[PDB]
Amino acid sequence: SMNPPPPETSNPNKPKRQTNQLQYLLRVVLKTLWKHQFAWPFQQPVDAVKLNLPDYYKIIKTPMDMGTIKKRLENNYYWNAQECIQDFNTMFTNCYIYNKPGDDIVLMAEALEKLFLQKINELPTE
Numbered sequence: 728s729m730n731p732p733p734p735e736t737s738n739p740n741k742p743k744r745q746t747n748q749l750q751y752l753l754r755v756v757l758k759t760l761w762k763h764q765f766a767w768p769f770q771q772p773v774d775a776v777k778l779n780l781p782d783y784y785k786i787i788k789t790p791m792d793m794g795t796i797k798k799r800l801e802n803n804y805y806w807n808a809q810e811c812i813q814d815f816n817t818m819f820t821n822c823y824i825y826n827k828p829g830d831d832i833v834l835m836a837e838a839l840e841k842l843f844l845q846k847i848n849e850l851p852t853e
């Protein structure tokens with residue numbers, strides 16, 4: 728297909744924990760970004776077939792998106808907050824790798840990244 732299988736949202740072996748920080752990442756951080764007017768291109772895996780982007784998965788080998796992150800949080804997939812933060816960060820840098828710098832999709836990502844940094848600056852102490 729052009730589309731790879733989507734990133735997993737569960738795993739038989741990967742260990743997990745629940746923490747107040749992971750709860751905050753779902754209830755506050757993911758929620759705040761998800762409701763933003765510019766969230767919609769980031770709420771699901773890039774569908775290269777639908778969007779006609781034959782080069783996307785030639786370039787992006789570690790895809791990530793907030794739909795996957797939301798499911799990972801809901802499924803208790805993460806061991807700690809750092810693992811979840813890493814997924815957000817991958818989502819943003821993938822956008823900057825793939826896209827032309829002046830593209831509106833990059834402007835959208837940048838607005839969401841600025842909000843994300845504000846929210847992570849208030850990550851509660853564990």
Ligand SMILES: Cn1ccc(-c2cn(C)c(=O)c3cn(C[C@H]4CCN(Cc5ccccc5)C4)nc23)n1
Nearest residue numbers: 767768769773778780821822825826830831832835
């Ligand atoms: C559902 N959906 C629509 C677009 C995407 C999308 C998501 N991600 C993460 C991306 O990194 C995308 C890259 N594209 C192609 C750009 C070329 C012209 N731009 C034009 C453009 C600008 C602003 C918004 C949409 C399209 C879009 N499209 C995407 N997902």
